[PDB]
């Protein structure tokens, strides 16, 4: 029984756990704590960039932003290079997906605009997807440091997880842009210790993490199967018994997803 194992995951990790997959064809969805709320941390980047993509032209993607010394507030690995000659919104699309740059994910809120630096716009998007549940409040730094159980900036694997669906695989964005959000979750570099060690190398994986205090780790994904067929994977944890210090622990996360992929193949 899944439940069971999730169960002794928490004990090995000292850690609370969530996971969804929602329904397919053939398989209920997969649910451990899935309407418990847990910390957005990064994750929240992932609808940020198909916000973004979906509220301009594609030719949007070339505007140049430019940006000082003190936006830079947030673990920002591609934006720090950049600050000297500014970042096209396609280049902080890349930069907030692929290797989670907070710089990037604010000025991408910023450019969605309106009231709490871009966080209303935001939250109003989901609330489009029909997404009553997640909420975003503060930018990075702040959405990541919420005490555990606070409902600032959190949403919940159930939620999360059909706001994905139907971004990758229905029909909340035009194909050209779907496309886009896609490849560059397709070619995401912060997330090979989390669902995608869970999976086979024949699956194919792409996917949003997020980090944070706490011993905060989640991991968003859509996968394929080696003939084709979608699931989406939202796996939440934190660690609130270890306190603001407590460590991250990707294997949790690896571990969960290896026991998903077991219910998959
Ligand atoms: C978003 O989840 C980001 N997380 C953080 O900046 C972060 C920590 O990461 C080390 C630790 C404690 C607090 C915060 O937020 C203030 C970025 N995304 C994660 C991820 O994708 O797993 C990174 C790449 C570790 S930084």
Known sequence: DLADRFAELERRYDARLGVYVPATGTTAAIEYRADERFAFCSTFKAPLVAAVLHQNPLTHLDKLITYTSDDIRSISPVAQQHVQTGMTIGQLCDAAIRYSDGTAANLLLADLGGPGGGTAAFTGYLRSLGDTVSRLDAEAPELNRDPPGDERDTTTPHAIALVLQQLVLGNALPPDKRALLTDWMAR??????????????????????????????????????????????????????????????????????????????
């Open 188 to 265: 995401n570099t912060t997330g090979a210790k989390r669902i995608r060690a869970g999976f086979p190398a024949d699956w194919k994986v792409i996917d949003k993490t997020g980090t944070g205090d706490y011993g905060r780790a989640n991991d968003i994904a859509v996968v394929w199967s080696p003939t084709g067929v979608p699931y989406v994977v939202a796996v939440m944890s934190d660690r609130a018994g270890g306190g603001y210090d407590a460590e991250p622990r990707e294997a949790l996360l690896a571990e969960a997803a290896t026991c998903v992929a077991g219910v998959l193949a």
